[PDB]
Amino acid sequence: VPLDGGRFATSDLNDLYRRVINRNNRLKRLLDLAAPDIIVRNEKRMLQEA
Amino acid sequence: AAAQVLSSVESEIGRTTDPVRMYMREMGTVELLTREGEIDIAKRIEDGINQVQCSVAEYPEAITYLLEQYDRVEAEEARLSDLITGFVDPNAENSIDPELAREKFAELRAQYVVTRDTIKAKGRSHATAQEEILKLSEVFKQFRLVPKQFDYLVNSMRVMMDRVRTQERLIMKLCVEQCKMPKKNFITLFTGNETSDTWFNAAIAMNKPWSEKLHDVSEEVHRALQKLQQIEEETGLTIEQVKDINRRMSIGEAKARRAKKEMVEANLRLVISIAKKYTRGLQFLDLIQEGNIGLMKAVDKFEYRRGYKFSTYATWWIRQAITRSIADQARTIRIPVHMIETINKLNRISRQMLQEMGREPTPEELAERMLMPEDKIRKVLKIAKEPISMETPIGDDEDSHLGDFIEDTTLELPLDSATTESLRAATHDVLAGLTAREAKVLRMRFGIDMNTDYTLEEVGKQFDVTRERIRQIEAKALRKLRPSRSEVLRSFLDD
């Protein structure tokens, strides 16, 4: 929602949904370039944290 | 031997739960290759690249694919679009000139018709003819194709192999999973005869009682061979030459994927030394992973003939992939990269005004150093905010958040709700006292008790086709309602 003086005020869940999506779209970019299996393991271990 | 030291750790760990420790542990095994291993690998990468060119030059129609798509575009009397970028593009080991588009194509059309006849004479595999086929491999070899159109030609090997591998397993499903044909005696006939239907009844010629009862699928099983024999009609290549490509091309894709896996995994510490200059917009491991995508791009573009070390070139790509992620991600309301570049330009110049003046620069006087007017400087300063939070504790104890004070300024007020159902009932009383055809058009023209809004023509379409007097019927009713009945409706004026 927008506040009075031109700012916005958000929930904390929007920040938690953005790093789920960003670390999920980037996993679909590593399965296309055929990344080595240390980069793909760390990305699946980063999506589990998000 | 740097992996047995992890098994001395892994069964005896202090149960780490930090993912940066687990990532920095795994990259610690692979050692740093120094000044020769970059050249030892860049020879292994290119030797896996030209083996893909060696398996393209064995395809007869891949020569014409660069020929026939060029025949589309000279019939338009002028063509310099994005297609002409992706074509032949010969290297001197770029705007193209039309005096060379017929010069370098003089020998490519010449070799196009000469090699057809030496294979037309004395068979497919004549000795002095296959050397010309090996020479026809070299007329393409001095060209460097743009790798967007080149990927369409690698699909001319993989899909044309998997189309037969679909056609192979389709016979293995429809008939072999029913009739149980043995795969020991069957693989000899695929390289034995492979042209006629004489292989078929020869299994019926020997007794083998499971094969006599193929009468009920006698119009079905070799009908699936009519598509495997369809590819022989359209491609026009013998089956011992088709397997000589996708096996030999399977070595060039596993030699280049293995050598790129070594150049990537050895230089993982170069990414982790740049990525910690950019941590606190995004995350600590989000910057590492986005630079590793930039490192895999730098391996593709690197050339060892230039005479520079690999870390001089790869640093430009990791710094490009990391800074592009801070501009795309790391913000809730996404700002494009041209405005982030202007916002960062204001924050490096306002520090310079804090150096000389010793005060904060006014937007009237900050506009001189940027070469921008006062309205755009003040408008770039409108975007300066970030969303705060709704769970920020604006009370000094842990009872109140900011979200408990933000009002729902959306719905309705119950005085404003009850003054509407009072107004909906006043109109049902006033219009009931008027003449029924003035009261009908007054409900249709203003949409009272309906869901639409008519026109003078639409109401004129129904009752009578007068135009100005429908407007005069409406204007008459306002005089019929203009100050004894208007005492209740004048109270609704004060909204």
Added chain:
Amino acid sequence: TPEEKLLRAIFGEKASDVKDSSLRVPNGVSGTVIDVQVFTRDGVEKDKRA
């Protein structure tokens, strides 16, 4: 609304592009104005009381 489209079309009072949000005295307070301070952004023209 459908009904309020008729009330404007009977007496004729149009609503312009102007909406009241004036600062009023908070209710329950009866005071006496002793000071007025007016701040103005640079470039913006001052009124006759500023």
Added chain:
Amino acid sequence: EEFDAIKIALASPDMIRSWSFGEVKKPETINYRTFKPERDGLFCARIFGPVKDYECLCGKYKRLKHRGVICEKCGVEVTQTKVRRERMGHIELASPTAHIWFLKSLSRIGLLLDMPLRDIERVLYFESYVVIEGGMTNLERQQILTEEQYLDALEEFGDEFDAKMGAEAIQALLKSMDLEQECEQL
């Protein structure tokens, strides 16, 4: 309006798609110049609903005369803005990730596999393998292999054993066990 009871269970992946109204594909919230919700984002109007009562994003249809239309220029249903409180979307994960509630809350996933919780987490963190199905009588199901020991049984066996890592292994161990045979064993 009228109900009698409140039932709670687990959500199937087909059920979570059944509550949904569209897939979120982008982390964008709104546009910074004109504060309107962008497509395919966390606030998208084609998925979750219109922002104003009976109005699409562009403005082609309005004011309740068009109630049951979907504006083909933008894709926003012309309905009330009360359905932004009730409509859900979904995200298709590119890798299956474990639920923290049925893993850490004391364990509901190592109680069903009879695996220790301190050993499941070595598989989830991509540290050590686990045997999904050992066809040769050398290895057993749910046997944990380090990355230096998995290479030895890779050469000795080839195809004869199934061993994975991550939550794609634990999804296979939960999919493989017969729940009826273990009540007929215990």
